[PDB]
């Protein structure tokens, strides 16, 4: 699978690894977010990562299907 | 860099 990465600037495509099939979108605030919103992570996994509190997380199957807030999937 | 939902360019640290 290919996904959305925040490794990289600005935020690129990568190819898995093999064995994971899902691409993830991680977010949280820190002391900025009433100004800038929730930080951003994108990445890829074999598992989900497993559901924190005070995070959200967001995991998925399909090319691209992580993309950042402010861009369309695909 | 951290990038935040507010933009697509990201931010220092």
Redesign the interface.
């Given at each position: 699978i290919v996904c959305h990465t925040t490794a990289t600037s600005p935020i690129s495509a990568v190819t898995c690894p093999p064995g994971e099939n899902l691409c993830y979108r991680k977010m949280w605030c820190d002391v900025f977010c009433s100004s800038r919103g929730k930080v951003v992570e994108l990445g890829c996994a074999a598992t989900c990562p497993s559901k924190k509190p005070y995070e959200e997380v967001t995991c998925c199957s399909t090319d691209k299907c992580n993309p950042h807030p402010k861009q369309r999937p695909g | 860099?951290?990038?935040?939902?507010?933009?697509?360019?990201?931010?220092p640290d």
């Amino acid at each position: 699978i290919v996904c959305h990465t925040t490794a990289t600037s600005p935020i690129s495509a990568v190819t898995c690894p093999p064995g994971e099939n899902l691409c993830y979108r991680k977010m949280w605030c820190d002391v900025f977010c009433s100004s800038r919103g929730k930080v951003v992570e994108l990445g890829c996994a074999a598992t989900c990562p497993s559901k924190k509190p005070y995070e959200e997380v967001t995991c998925c199957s399909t090319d691209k299907c992580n993309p950042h807030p402010k861009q369309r999937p695909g | 860099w951290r990038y935040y939902e507010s933009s697509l360019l990201p931010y220092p640290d």
